[PDB]
């Protein structure tokens, strides 16, 4: 199944954290609307964080990471939970080569803000 | 129920990071094994990150979030999610007044590290 | 916080499925825009299904469980998790006495049907 | 990613439970340790249970879900979620066709039980 894509409220501020955690420098593209609006770039291997941004989830709500190093396509995991009906979690992980931790870089949206 | 309470593998290591998304000024306690090891204090209404660290789960991996407004415990929500069999995250909303948004300190746990 | 209410899409065609883990007769209580639409009643201690229908969520889309053991009402815990930015589970636990297993009625509602 | 492939607690009673609905008739593999230890066949496009069974996780704790409609796998989406840090879902979806909604075979288990 594609992975990494969620639908928001429209019009909705979200926030977005990216961590690391791998010997490869991440790329993590963030789009919303299938228009990139933040590129985050980082590395660690002790879950640094390599962003941390506020977002508006604009007519459509739709929002998608990707996730590469140095160009190649990171495998991707990911899935929604909603706590107390109100919370709002997207959850991302990604796995950049055999060890299958998938917390090469690890994103997470989350929404209400305010 | 308790909520806010999470067995992890003992030894382990993990994040934990929070957002305050409320007027008033958040306070969460995170306790490895019973004993507080952390304390965020912050205040915003835009998920600014009130704190990140890395810590151990030690010999009993028991972790636990509190969040509370000058002494006031705020109400919890939260759950557990694992993905590809092996990202967990450990997620926790918290409410300091009557709206029922619980974004009021957020905190996320993510383990494994590295 | 209120536990086993979610907002599903209004106007939708949803699974709901109880199972009972307890020495306790269980009855687990339907509501669908606040009113009572289904009724399961059984008692196992080895996961029988106690009831699975289909319902529509309604112009609200507002769906509540309840769950009772001889008319006290037992304690709930829940989630909702989205897989693959369609498939919907909304969770509940409920724990009729003082072991915290949260399973004595375990209730599963699923969407999208068909 | 590999999906549908579960660590759960070892030596543990689970149950498992699947849906169908889709027009082809589903057939779902359950592996505990590697081997088959339960078949589900059936046909629904209205969430119709083509099988329910209790299950011991044995010394491993490894439970695979495997979904194909006449001889055609199925590909599968998943996670686990934990609620009250006790009860358990790991959670399974399936596609056939080009639809993508997912539901075609849903797959739940939950532990613990009694
Ligand atoms: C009107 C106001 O300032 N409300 C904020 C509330 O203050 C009340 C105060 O007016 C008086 O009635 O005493 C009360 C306690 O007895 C309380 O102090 O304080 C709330 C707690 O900090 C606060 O709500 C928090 O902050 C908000 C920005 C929001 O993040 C809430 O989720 C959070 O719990 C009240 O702020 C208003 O909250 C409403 C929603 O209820 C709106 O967001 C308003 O814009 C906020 O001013
Ligand atoms: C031996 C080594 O350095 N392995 C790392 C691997 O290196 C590749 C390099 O050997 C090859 O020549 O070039 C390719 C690119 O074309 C790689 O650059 O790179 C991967 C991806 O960065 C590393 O794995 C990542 O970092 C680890 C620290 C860990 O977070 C892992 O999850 C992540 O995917 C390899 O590092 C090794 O990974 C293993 C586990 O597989 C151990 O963690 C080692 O300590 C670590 O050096
Ligand atoms: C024309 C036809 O017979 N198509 C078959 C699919 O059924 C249709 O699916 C569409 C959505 O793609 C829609 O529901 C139509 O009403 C169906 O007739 C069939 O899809 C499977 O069965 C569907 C009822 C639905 O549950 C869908 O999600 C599921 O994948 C596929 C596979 O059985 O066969 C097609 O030939
Ligand atoms: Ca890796
Ligand atoms: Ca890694
Ligand atoms: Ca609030
Ligand atoms: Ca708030
Ligand atoms: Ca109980
Ligand atoms: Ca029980
Ligand atoms: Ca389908
Ligand atoms: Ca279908």
């Not at 709500?61 to 706590?83: E, F, M, P």
């Not at 919370?87 to 931790?101: H, I, P, Q, R």
């Amino acid at each position: 199944a594609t992975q990494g894509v969620f639908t928001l409220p429209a019009n909705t501020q979200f926030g977005v954290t990216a961590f690391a955690n791998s010997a490869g420098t991440q790329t993590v593209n963030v789009q919303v609307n299938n228009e990139t609006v933040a590129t985050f770039t980082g590395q660690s291997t002790n879950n640094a964080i390599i962003g941390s941004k506020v977002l508006n989830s604009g007519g459509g709500g739709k929002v998608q990471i990707l996730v590469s190093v140095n160009g190649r396509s990171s495998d991707l995991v990911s899935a929604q939970v909603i706590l107390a009906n109100e919370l709002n979690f997207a959850l991302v992980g990604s796995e950049d080569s055999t060890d299958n931790d998938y917390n090469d870089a690890v994103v997470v949206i989350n929404w209400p803000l305010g």
